[PDB]
Amino acid sequence: MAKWVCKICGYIYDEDAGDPDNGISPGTKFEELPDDWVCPICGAPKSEFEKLED
């Protein structure tokens, strides 16, 4: 499981945590989030996220 940052607002999408309040179970990989899922803080699309890895 990995972490991805919203380049706009700094929210971390943690795969371990998911986003249950917006229909995403803990353990959902970023690639598997629906194409229309957005950052729960700022509304940015998936395109605005970057994986926190080298």
Is 9 among the annotated ligand-binding positions?
yes
CB of 2 to Fe ion, least distance (A): 17
User: Could you give the CA distance from residue 26 to residue 42 in angstroms, rounded to a whole number?
Assistant: 20
Q: Is 11 in the site for Fe ion (CB under 5 A)?
A: yes
Is 13 among the annotated ligand-binding positions?
no
Residue of 41, 45, 50, 51 that binds Fe ion (CB under 5 A)? 41
Contacts of 51 (CB under 8 A, 6+ apart): 2, 3, 4, 30
Q: Is 42 in the site for Fe ion (CB under 5 A)?
A: yes
Are β-strands 12-14 and 49-51 bridged in parallel, bridged antiparallel, or unpaired? unpaired
Annotated binding site for Fe cation: 6, 9, 39, 42
